[PDB]
């Protein structure tokens, strides 16, 4: 037969080798595209997650029922000591892929 | 405000058409066969009904 009552699905199939990661740290899978007008600059950093804490700020979204009032907003604290550059790598485009 | 000539100029593009009774296409005013292959170039055509 058909399902008696319709229903939305559980979970998402777009994430479906649901298993332990081979890595331990994040592996950025696609870096932002370079607009060669801009002066050279890095793209990504490497930080450590410390904990969480509050914050209090104003807000100036025009039209919101929360305009020009306090809001409290849960935040993290990602401690980020300066890294150290040690090596350079060059990549060449190949019809197969990147080398 | 719309003028005499302009209205009949507008009626040329929106109001003087031939319609195909099997697929509801919008043919050019002197056609006796439809244009689309999803009804088979049928020749059952009627003028697009002009307003009151």
């Amino acid at each position: 037969s058909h399902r008696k009552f319709s229903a939305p699905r559980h979970g998402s199939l777009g994430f479906l080798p649901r298993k332990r990661s081979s890595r331990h740290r994040g592996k950025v899978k696609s870096f932002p595209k370079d607009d060669p007008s801009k002066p050279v600059h890095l793209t990504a950093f490497l930080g450590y997650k410390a904990g969480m804490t509050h914050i209090v700020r104003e807000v100036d979204r025009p039209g919101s029922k929360v305009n020009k009032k306090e809001v409290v907003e849960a935040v993290t604290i990602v401690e980020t000591p300066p890294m150290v550059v040690v090596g350079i790598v060059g990549y060449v485009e190949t019809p197969r892929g990147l080398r | 405000i719309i003028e005499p000539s302009l209205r009949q100029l507008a009626q040329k593009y929106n109001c003087d058409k031939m319609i195909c009774r099997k697929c509801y296409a919008r043919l050019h005013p002197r056609a006796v066969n439809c244009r689309k292959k999803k009804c088979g170039h049928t020749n059952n055509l009627r003028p697009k009904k002009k307003v009151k």
Partner: protein, 190 residues
């Protein structure tokens, strides 16, 4: 079936020189040059006479659908003759019954912004094809003018701004407004 020959001749004016590399007719007149590529169309083109008096197209052994292109090759060249000597003007009028169409030519010949159409707050901007210049008519209160030396780019670029102002979800035979082509002439005519 299988007609042994059906040809056509293009008498071209004496102010024009036309050259053709096999099937890439290049026409040059008082206003500029035009290049058109007739490939995958299978017609042999010839050119006869001093000053290039006449262009002669040819077509051997052609069935019906393959025959009716001998004139189409001829007919486009006429538009490449006329478009380069005279130059096309496509006059087009703005019909409005709600309240004014506010068209302003933001640049030389492109970005034809169309405000207050049907009362909308959207600024419908349209970019003309290369080499087609749009000007708001000094001659009449509500007309644009598209001048260009190629019918396909001139005529298409008119259909955009006509089609880019379309009433939606309303009785079309009642909401008669927009921008609709009126006159299809030349730059110098008589």
């Amino acid at each position: 079936m299988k007609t042994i020959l059906s040809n056509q001749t293009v008498d071209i004016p004496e102010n024009v020189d036309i050259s053709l590399k096999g099937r890439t007719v290049i026409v040059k007149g008082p206003r500029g040059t035009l290049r058109r590529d007739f490939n995958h169309i299978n017609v042999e083109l010839s050119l006869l006479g001093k000053k290039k008096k006449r262009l002669r197209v040819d077509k051997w052994w052609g069935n019906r659908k393959e025959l009716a292109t001998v004139r189409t090759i001829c007919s486009h060249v006429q538009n490449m003759i006329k478009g380069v000597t005279l130059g096309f003007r496509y006059k087009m009028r703005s019909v409005y019954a709600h309240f004014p169409i506010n068209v302003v030519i933001q640049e030389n010949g492109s970005l034809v912004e169309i405000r207050n159409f049907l009362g909308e707050k959207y600024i419908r901007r349209v970019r003309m094809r290369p080499g087609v210049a749009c000007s708001v008519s000094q001659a009449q209160k509500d007309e644009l003018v598209l001048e260009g030396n190629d019918i396909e780019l001139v005529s298409n670029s008119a259909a955009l701004i006509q089609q880019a102002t379309t009433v939606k979800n309303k009785d079309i035979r009642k909401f008669l407004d927009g921008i609709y082509v009126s006159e299809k002439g030349t730059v110098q005519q008589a």
